[PDB]
Design a protein around this ligand. Structure first.
Ligand SMILES: CC(C)(COP(=O)(O)OP(=O)(O)OC[C@H]1O[C@@H](n2cnc3c(N)ncnc32)[C@H](O)[C@@H]1OP(=O)(O)O)[C@@H](O)C(=O)NCCC(=O)NCCS
Length: 184
């Protein structure tokens, strides 16, 4: 019984079998996956969706599927994922987002994130939500700072689930706490 969340334009909902085709197309898109190690095949796409469903089943929240009523059934995901890996800022909850390029430049990731963080702070009453990306992924960390999240460059970290010499290992960390979120 996953709780659906509404924004002006977006419905943040549980994933459905019919989303897997659309999400597979996104995951096969080199523009969507530019700042990730590689594009995913259908098998790898479906495996990510399985982890999302598992997260929802365990925690009652997760990276929500993004529906746009009056327009499109599925445009990607935005939502929360518990951080359990061996990093300095664990344990905590992260926020992440992936949109079909057709829906870029419309403030839809912004709106989805505002809906997710409202849930995070008003409903779950989390003390903090984090987000991390690579320096070249400016669309991603641009959104983080526009949402009012803030980065300390001293908190730059090597991702523990990548090789020690991996060229995409260096990540930057953004944080927003309940006070900062309530204040903006
Ligand atoms: C990261 C990502 C979600 C950002 O999406 P986005 O559409 O650029 O983000 P926003 O929702 O903040 O939209 C901002 C843009 O829309 C505009 N905008 C913002 N609010 C708006 C509104 N209410 N109405 C109209 N336009 C609006 C802004 O001017 C901006 O345009 P610009 O980027 O050309 O300057 C998207 O690029 C993506 O999915 N990237 C690939 C996957 C990825 O790397 N994810 C992150 C992994 S760490």
């Amino acid at each position: 019984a996953i709780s659906e969340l509404h924004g002006p334009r977006l419905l943040l909902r549980a994933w459905r079998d019919s989303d897997r085709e659309a999400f597979a197309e996104m995951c096969a898109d080199p523009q969507v996956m530019e700042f990730f190690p590689s594009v995913l095949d259908r098998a790898q796409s479906d495996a990510l969706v399985d982890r999302v469903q598992a997260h929802f089943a365990e925690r009652g929240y997760g990276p929500w599927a993004l529906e746009l009523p009056g327009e499109a059934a599925f445009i990607g995901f935005t939502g929360l994922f518990d951080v359990t890996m061996d990093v300095h800022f664990a344990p905590t909850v992260e926020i992440g987002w992936r949109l079909a390029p057709a829906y870029w430049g419309r403030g839809l990731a912004r709106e989805a994130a505002e809906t997710a963080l409202d849930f995070a702070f008003e409903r779950l009453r989390l003390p903090e939500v984090v987000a991390f990306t690579t320096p070249p992924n400016r669309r991603s960390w641009g959104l983080m700072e526009r949402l009012g999240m803030r980065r300390d460059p001293a908190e730059d970290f090597d991702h523990p689930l990548l090789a020690a010499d991996h060229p995409m290992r260096r990540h930057i960390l953004y944080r927003v706490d309940a006070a900062r979120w309530a204040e903006r």
